[PDB]
Design a protein around this nucleic acid. Structure first.
Ligand code: MN
Ligand code: MN
Ligand code: ZN
Ligand code: ZN
Ligand code: ZN
Ligand code: ZN
Lengths: 162, 162
DNA sequence: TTGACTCTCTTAAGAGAGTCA
DNA sequence: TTGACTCTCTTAAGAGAGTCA
């Protein structure tokens, strides 16, 4: 809600509730042939999810609280960043999963960045494979690799140059 | 429907028309602090675009040919790949701009791959910066770099560990 | 047969808001 | 007030198909 005190109280209640989600250990590629361990705090698969939480999509949730007799609602991963600017360079700020695990709500696995920055982490080589993200990746992106390209650049005639 | 010879004739007509598009020389980052040059064959900004071409969206075009009284139509960048498989690993193949220039129709700047592989090239460090794409990038992706993250992972209490 | 427009759809990273009990 | 559902929207890489002359 409007007051900084009210916002801190929302963040604190959110953290307390998410802190009771089951902690699931995931072993993950870091890049460079190395492996690490992440501890994700995962929202349940089905109702009930926790005080204040409800599912609005297969992998989408919202957090809601009643303040001054009014309901206030947020995307479930946006709550840690309620005191941050909600845009950057004219682009909407988004909650970005460093662990690439949608159900996870561990704020130590989230950052707040443009949708382009967010998406791009899917292909990052990782913190031990050359990640250059200023807010560093926690793991190699799940889509990093050589790809599966069916056909490369080609011409039949002689009209084009690279 | 269309025979192999007829499909080859469609590709040849497409190449002959695109070959006459304005050729624009662009200096581009290759990764590793090096600069290279790409030559893009750019479809015009407004009609007329060239024989067989029409705009279906702000940055979308189609190629159309009528053969034996039947109208055939293709996405304007898909024509080089009409003799290739149209899916791989259960994913639809898409025309993917190695030059990251939508208006460009140079077939030496296109490859044919899943939409995820396609998107991922936006963040590639480039052919002289560590590209691991099996069909190699022609340039560093426009979105490669440290990013502009507004807020990183953080908690107010002590409920979480990474 | 052709040109120049029109419309909606896909994907996978993300969102907001309403209906009931 | 809190819970458990419903619906559609945004972005930026990509698509198919209709209408009229
Ligand atoms: Mn993400
Ligand atoms: Mn692309
Ligand atoms: Zn996590
Ligand atoms: Zn990274
Ligand atoms: Zn090009
Ligand atoms: Zn590459």
């Amino acid at each position: 809600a409007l007051t900084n005190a009210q916002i801190l109280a929302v963040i604190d209640s959110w953290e307390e509730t998410v802190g009771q989600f089951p902690v699931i250990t995931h072993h993950v590629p870091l890049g460079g042939g190395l492996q690490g361990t992440l501890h994700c705090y995962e929202i349940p698969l089905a109702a009930p999810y926790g005080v204040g939480f409800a599912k609005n999509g297969p992998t989408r949730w919202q957090y809601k609280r009643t303040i001054n007799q009014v309901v206030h609602r947020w995307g479930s991963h946006t709550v840690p960043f309620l005191l941050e600017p909600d845009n950057i360079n004219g682009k909407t700020c988004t909650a970005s999963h460093l662990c690439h695990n949608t159900r996870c709500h561990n704020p130590l696995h989230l950052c707040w960045e443009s949708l382009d920055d967010n998406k791009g982490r899917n292909w990052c080589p990782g913190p031990n494979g050359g990640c250059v993200h200023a807010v560093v990746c926690l793991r190699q992106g799940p889509l990093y690799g050589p790809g599966a390209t069916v056909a490369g650049p080609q011409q039949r005639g002689s009209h084009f140059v690279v």
